[PDB]
Symmetry: D3
């Protein structure tokens, strides 16, 4: 309409009316998980895959609760419909909620359940989408798997907010981080791909397993582009034939420079373009489409 | 009313009316820091040290904002007064707030500022405080300093919520974690102390530098108890003469067992008792006291 | 099969009650020895050659090479089992650096202690837990780095996992898995780990003892056209898996219904777990990889 | 000179008759801890400190058992007398024993308790004591504290047997190992000291806290020699003014070379000699002495 | 007219006269990269692949400069011609050069460009090639990827010179190093292969990606020998059926012993021999050859 | 502009004619160590301490060779005199040299010995020395002690050249690096100090033990400023009361910002200023001075 409409605990409310309690454990302790699915031209894309991953994060965090997957699916679709946006970024969130008493046991909780729908967003302006972004490598490393596993898509992102501040101060568009073995992982919003001698490579470990990343591997196979999940160092990225990131926010995004090394060739390169064009062509098929109308 | 009164962005509102926006970056991204100070019998204890630590976290997270240190002090005192408590647990929080402008630049923001005051809390019931608690060592490690430094007291604690899940499932009262070198660090709420041959030891690195921890070392010196900050492994804890944790939530807390190893001797041990008594004696005094009533200036 | 097990020790067959390890055996004082364990079921030893291969790998890596031939060890394994009158058995064979030889102990110059100990076949859980699944935790203790005491050794140096066992029992779990220092799941003291996700079988790739049961599971998966992958897995992968099971010469495949408070989704045992377990025991009621205690 | 007499589970038996069961968990699983104390000219030295450390390892490994500290002290003295010795190397061992019950629960066990006594031993021959030994640095690292803590003095030493094999193949007297941060730790038998500009230094972490090490720090203080526990790398050792190792087997032992770097100055150096002399002068007294007679 | 002729910044000079400035940043700071290609019987082998790798290292180190790849190729060919060696080891080097102004900015520099041609060299004498060499594992680890990436072939090799000192003092022919996870990486001159149960294995990470290593994998496929890139520990090496290293200096080199463990079976083993013979057969053809033609 | 004069293997030559061979192992393999001492108003400062460290590096790298410590000292002093500078940056270098005999064995070598004298250099311009520099934290870590120990002052610095390119591309004056435990170590040219509540702190491990760093600790004691060597994280630096780096190239250098965190209070802070003032006061005295001219 005017104000965004929020789904929150079963109610649809204008954002200015929707309320998280100041003692919600999602707020005080970061005790929640989330996922983000997108709509393009009236169709939500890979809603089932994103719900699968959401419920994976829920299982690992012991956030299992009574709201069915079907009810979550209905809430996602209906919240999008009520915001009237055909192109949208759709975030769904569950937290451990407000304390039952001062006797807090994370196995005994009433969840906070939210859907927030905003306009579709890219991660760079149109010029940088066409000519490529500049990335740096952060001084901050990714979380080890035995701390807060990167596989979680969760509320605990102060780490990457401070990386963002670092990137902006250094004059870069974004920053990738390494794992503690010095191999390139991902960025806060995106997974990383490189191309070398006609082969597509992407980090294997220490990452959130993006749905866009999954889709790019699927498209590569369909396009007869060989691909490999493997450990990559920054060196691999600097010498690559092509570099791009990918995210639900904008799909594939070409990279023209990493840490002062201009990627050789023209950016975007030919495999980057082929994958990008195939991604957006797939999204006008009925493959993985959930219509907001139908 | 017994409904809590909270400070939020300059207003004092009943908790049920106070609102955090669902798009607050403290909520969506854990982009916020916090601290907790306690009141006992009408005095806040070590308010200045807690404010200094809060503003350290703010500085490191680039959360600098327009509310001064003494405005936070006034908000802390006034929120406590409005809740009618002389014994209290006082949490104060700043977040990067709701996004400002089209493109979110964390250097340009309007903060969310909150004070939440509740009754004073201990980390264990009175029987466990008297006999000592049972701790395990978690399978989850602390954050490396080059990820999310343990020095931040911040909203990003899913890590320790899952550790708590595991501790409860395993039948323990709480869990310590190690750093990635295998040395004991801390727990989510507390720092760790041990005693060996009359000397007090506490981990040196990979921790939140607790104000209770600081106070314990100050008290040890006043009691002529030698102390050392050093790297400790779980082995050191199992074989210690005494073990205790410490937190603003309850002061010192004796530990009778860690990971199936019963700490030898009587629990609480004599140095634990001496430190615990000197702590609460210190707080029946005016030392590091900010009174809830009358003028709050130190003299 | 008596009230007194009979063991092989340095060429002699005698009751365990009488058999003697010296208090100054370096296997005792220093853990300077390696071992392996093979099983017999319904009159057949299973994969004896594979277990002997692994034993002699451990021997080679620890420079425990000695005179007793592989054929001699095979003969002693079979004969010790027969002397105990067992058709179902758990058979442990051990070599140590032995008692000090010479004045200056030099690990290249030694007289080994060679033992075969035979006991009834054992499972790692009782019948109800084999049927419904066990509960595992993740240990606070990590596996050994490859540059300390490589996990590839099957050796006597297991105080590490004895203390893990104490911790698991105190915590109310059936057993504990450990991680490596990168935080990826490795194994347990007795078993390797498998998970199932979306119809694919996964198992840790590094930082483990390469179990013979593990080898067999992968062979059986291929025979059943179940895709499999060796890869790094974190605890997260385990919590979210469709199915989880461990495997060991002690009992074969063992379903897992819960890890660290996360109940594995679906029914335990899951369909791939059941298919592999069934195929394992079917394989062993044949003569595939069988050495008959009979000789026939 | 007849065969050694061993204490085992309350009995004093000739070694040839003393039996560890093939299924003792100390044998099959290395489930046991040990300590070693020495006698010199009729006096056991620092018996109480060694018993304290033994019972520390017992506590950490949950090997608590019924044999009292007094009973262990009595067994240590009596076994030595029973072997007719006035100087001795005395090893005392407790294991988790033979399994008790149907279900192996390490919390419920019957221990194996052993005392093995032999003549006093040094770690190097006369010439090497006089002129110094040659050490290398192993390719094998010490155990991380969260695996099998170095603080345990335990039966699980295949690790250092293989280090010994490598040292002998390489032509060295012994090998030190590093921790995983690359700092020098210890050897299988000894702790490590260096001297630089008149100050004694010794590794602070990742080690067995030797009783000889403790004694060396006490003697340094008596001699007004400043000392520090600190992280040391191999570099620190190569450039040191003096280097020596220490152990109950032989006391201090000078080191003339590490990994091809000859330690500068005369070996043994002046502080090494002062500490060595003060240790043996202490050993000739009754300080920290438990006499074998009276 | 018998001494070596050096290419240096466009001039061909006797080695005696060729000069690196004492303030060249390749000298003072190790600020340079290099590669080495070989000639056999008048053919340079895989010159294009070695140039590809050289320009990879240049790209990663921001050593891009005005000398074209064709110019480098011509300089390599012509320098080899002028030295009159039909069998040769050809080293080509680029450094950041002498500081180019009052502010030293590594982005603005005039390079030092050198080609040095020497006789072809094996890494062991012919008897050791026949019987196999003896390798140890170094106490020194490889560089982490986030320090100085092992993917660089660069001037910064004090690390391996000290490892060589260690190996010689210990009486070994050479030393392998591990990465910080304890898995075998490589040596200063060579990559490492093992054979187990008819399959060829080689480390996957933490290494220079040798061109000889690439060639070995190609030859194995030609010979229908299965191969895998994977993490290997020292244990894997000790128990292997066969072990060999490989390098542009000498091709494949059999290994008969590692760290006191004699590799089982005959050395060289059958797969080692098959690959070695296939390598040298290839070197006697025009495959991948750039002829030296006057 | 007279040409610089270089000491090289016993000869004093104009830089233009001084030659390193393209096959010197210092060039091809980085097989060499070095140190740098400074002269100020005609006095070399702490020459003996720098020679001590140089010969420590030599010992650890087994670069032991025939040129005595006194011959090195005389070469350092004479090379400086011949360049006619009263303020100088003096670098002395030994490498494993050109290969000798028939097979290269690093235990048997003929060294390359060089002294290079240049004008005294600061690490930032006058405005930045006055108001403080801006530092970032590098994505590249320091060398582990069991790879190439940071205690070496050696020729193998491609690592820090690439860190420099990154700092310059990011718009910073320089970059600190951490060790692999995430604690702050040092920069290519300098050690790092912070001040918190009247106490001076500096990293304890994973660093070159600088002579300027040694001097700062000395001066702090002389000024009754407490100090500690300890592990510090980037967090410690952001929240410090004062931050400064130190080097033979320029002494103490104030730091006004690290990685977008402006250091609180006025830069340079009071302890930074007191130490800086005491450093240059010490250097205007006899203390640790070797005069360039005879007496
Ligand atoms: C969500 C996210 C991504 C992108 O995942 P998609 O499923 O493709 O949107 C990448 N990295 C991180 C850290 C993320 O949180
Ligand atoms: C706040 C907290 C403590 C306790 O600190 P105090 O200042 O004594 O209340 C200990 N550890 C962690 C992780 C904490 O967050
Ligand atoms: C022996 C053992 C196993 C199981 O191996 P199997 O050959 O299948 O019996 C697994 N992990 C460890 C650590 C073991 O010692
Ligand atoms: C026992 C031992 C020592 C020496 O300790 P002392 O108490 O002095 O005999 C040193 N290192 C290790 C690994 C040891 O086991
Ligand atoms: C160059 C080199 C090799 C061998 O590579 P080739 O291309 O086969 O000559 C192996 N390891 C290292 C460290 C090297 O520098
Ligand atoms: C030389 C250097 C320093 C400064 O040392 P000074 O002796 O004070 O000049 C600091 N860090 C590194 C890495 C250096 O090489």
């Amino acid at each position: 309409s005017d104000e965004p409409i929020i789904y929150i605990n079963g109610d649809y409310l204008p954002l200015s009316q929707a309320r998280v309690s100041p003692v919600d454990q999602g707020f005080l302790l970061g005790d929640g998980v989330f996922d983000v699915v997108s709509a393009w031209k009236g169709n939500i894309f890979k809603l089932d895959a994103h719900l699968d991953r959401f419920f994976d994060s829920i299982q690992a965090a012991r956030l299992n609760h009574d709201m069915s997957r079907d009810a979550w699916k209905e809430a996602i679709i209906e919240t999008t419909r009520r915001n009237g946006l055909d192109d949208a970024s759709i975030r769904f969130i569950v937290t451990r909620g407000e304390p039952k008493g001062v006797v807090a046991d994370p196995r005994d909780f009433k969840p906070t359940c939210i859907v927030w729908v905003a306009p579709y967003i890219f991660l760079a302006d149109e010029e940088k989408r066409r000519n490529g972004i500049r990335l740096m490598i952060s001084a901050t490393r990714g979380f080890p798997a035995d701390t807060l596993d990167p596989r979680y898509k969760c509320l605990d992102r102060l780490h990457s907010q401070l990386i963002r501040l670092e990137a902006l101060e250094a004059g870069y568009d974004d920053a990738l981080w390494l794992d503690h073995s010095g191999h390139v992982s991902e960025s806060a919003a995106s997974n990383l791909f490189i191309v070398k001698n006609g082969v597509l490579y992407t980090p294997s470990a220490g990452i959130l397993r993006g749905i866009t990343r999954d889709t790019i591997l699927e498209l590569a196979t369909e396009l007869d582009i060989p691909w490999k999940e493997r450990q990559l160092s920054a060196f691999d990225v600097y010498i690559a034939d092509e570099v791009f990131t990918c995210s639900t926010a904008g799909g594939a995004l070409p990279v023209r420079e990493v840490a002062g090394r201009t990627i050789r060739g023209t950016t975007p390169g030919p495999i980057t373009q082929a994958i990008d064009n195939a991604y957006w062509a797939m999204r006008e098929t009925d493959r993985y489409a959930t219509p907001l109308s139908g």
